[PDB]
Subunit: 271 residues, 3 copies
Amino acid sequence: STFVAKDGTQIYFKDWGSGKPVLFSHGWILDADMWEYQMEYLSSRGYRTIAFDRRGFGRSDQPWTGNDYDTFADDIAQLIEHLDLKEVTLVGFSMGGGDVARYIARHGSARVAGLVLLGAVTPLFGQKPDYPQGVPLDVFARFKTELLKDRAQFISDFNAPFYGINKGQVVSQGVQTQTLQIALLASLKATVDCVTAFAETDFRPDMAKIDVPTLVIHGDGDQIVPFETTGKVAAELIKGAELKVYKDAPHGFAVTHAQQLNEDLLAFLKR
Amino acid sequence: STFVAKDGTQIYFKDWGSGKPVLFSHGWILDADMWEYQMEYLSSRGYRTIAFDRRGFGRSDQPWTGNDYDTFADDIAQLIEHLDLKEVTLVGFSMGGGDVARYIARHGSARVAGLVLLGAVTPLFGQKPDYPQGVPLDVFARFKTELLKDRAQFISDFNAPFYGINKGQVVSQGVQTQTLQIALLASLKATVDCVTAFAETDFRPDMAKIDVPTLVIHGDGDQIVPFETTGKVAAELIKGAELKVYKDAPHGFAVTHAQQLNEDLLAFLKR
Amino acid sequence: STFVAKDGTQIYFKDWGSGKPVLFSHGWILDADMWEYQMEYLSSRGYRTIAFDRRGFGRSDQPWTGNDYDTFADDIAQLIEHLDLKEVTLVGFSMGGGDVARYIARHGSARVAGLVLLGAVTPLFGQKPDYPQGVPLDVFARFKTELLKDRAQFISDFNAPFYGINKGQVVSQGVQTQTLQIALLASLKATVDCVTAFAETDFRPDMAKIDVPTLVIHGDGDQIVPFETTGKVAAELIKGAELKVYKDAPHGFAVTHAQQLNEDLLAFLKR
Ligand SMILES: [Cl-]
Ligand SMILES: [Cl-]
Ligand SMILES: [Cl-]
Ligand SMILES: [Cl-]
Ligand SMILES: [Cl-]
């Protein structure tokens, strides 16, 4: 399915099953397919599951402008409006944790039953004056330089630390092939602009606005989005949030810990 | 090109050339591109060729519902009506033999000049009480279990018995790459529901409804859809059907036996 | 974005940034993504960048008919008209040098500020009675035969001479994977007809119609489109054209010499 955002950007989404809705926001160089197993799992068990390709990614249009969290958050608002969703459980992975938090901050939580932040960049990923423990901006600047030289090889090399294959996690060649295939669908421009966005955007004000049940899940072996300065802090800053730590899990844990995640999502929805 | 099915599903198709129409229905985890050489061959020789991506596959939408042979047959009916096709020769490969057969069973043959069943699941693939020679259902249940764990690696491993590479057929790396790339476009949900559909659907009543010239072609090395219990029987059950057995040919014989298939299709059309 | 051509063919394009427009025409078995680094570079520096997927390629429709330079040129005209572009700099790579030249030839240069020809087939690629130095037609006949047997393996094998990898150019596996992925999106029919088109079409008359500033760039290690009989002659035949030769550069120099190309394009636009 598609809808057209305010600026004319066409956004691809899937809307499966019926019942209470669960809306998924994918990570960086991924698309809505990263959620296919969670969607099948929950839609076969009485839920409606919705997942979009972020602007610039997968099957969506690739606009030059609007590659920032405020626009990402408003794109989600438009999707929710378009389908007239109510009591939605928002689920964000990695950089996609930021647009679901920012949606709540910009639009409130009247339509929202709950929030799930999976290996998410919230509440803040990069360094700030009062957050020297964040990732230094020159680290991201280097990634951008590499992406602007050869993004295809960048993505290909990113598979190992993403899935923790370099630390003994086991992920098939098939999954690695699918990951690269999907990543190459994306815009070079959106790919690089998203680094800027997740490097620099501060979601600490957003955390104070989250007034729904919230589950934070993070792998403490995550090489991409460090657990200690992201998920651990998000769970403390969000009132009433629950935290689950998957021991030694990598960033790409929707793959390596698929069944555990499916069960945790179900348990949260049935709380 | 696209048409929209009754339930809102957008379906991609290609419609090439002019003349008497030949409408192709692809196999499992493939899409309309599996026919590109047959389409070029026949459309360069004065036929109109049409091939669609089944719902849930290729460039088509991925609906949660309607992944069953009655709906697939009705999709084909909608395409035929969409383009107002007459004297159409229907050509179905593998699981795609089922939806062309079920189209005739549900809609009759007023628009149909002839039927070709290529390595097809017809008349019945899975075991029934009166068909113990069919494939036991626990075989398909295991496939579903494996697809719900890692469909990307399932498809990758499937290449070998599909093309008979495991038994000495020679197929390029290029073709194996293209096969996996196209398979990964598909929905996880459609991929799994199709297994249920081809495992359990009985097309034996459909065979009695086929009242047009019919050619059945099957490889006798077919490791996926066994000739003895499918194409052999389909040819005996359809009145006036002709049977061609490709010696030592695998399931993926539109690739391994491309030229022979092209020439046999042309001869059938010219009969 | 998309527009619909005269014959109903839907063509995908990207339109990025603002400022003076630069319209890019890709090579054979590529798509608009081949320009992503040039588009990012120029659109980050005050230019509007536009690149389309040629009919039969990438994300565009795959028509049976119209796979010829006159139609290609008219598709470009229709895109220029669709966006009401003025003072456009046309940039064509490889076979795409032909449709920008033919667009000037058929429609004039009222809308055009400049022309850039990159490893282009202009002014004539294949042999003619007065051009025995051209590539013999049996060479292209053999490519077509191979493509009509196994286009996927043809493309895979083409990576090496395209990028000069067989002559010590260094190109990542990621770029080669991306090149194959994009090529496989294309129509078999379009892929084959384009060979006929660039083999046989004579752009020598077109050269005399080009009355705008023109930069010709070509690598003199080009194994696909020989510098001596194409770019070298195009630069001599177009009044006032500038020529730059990249020493030992291959056909796929937008990849191997990306930064040098970006800087040359920018220098040209600023002249
Ligand atoms: Cl269960
Ligand atoms: Cl608390
Ligand atoms: Cl009979
Ligand atoms: Cl010169
Ligand atoms: Cl040089």
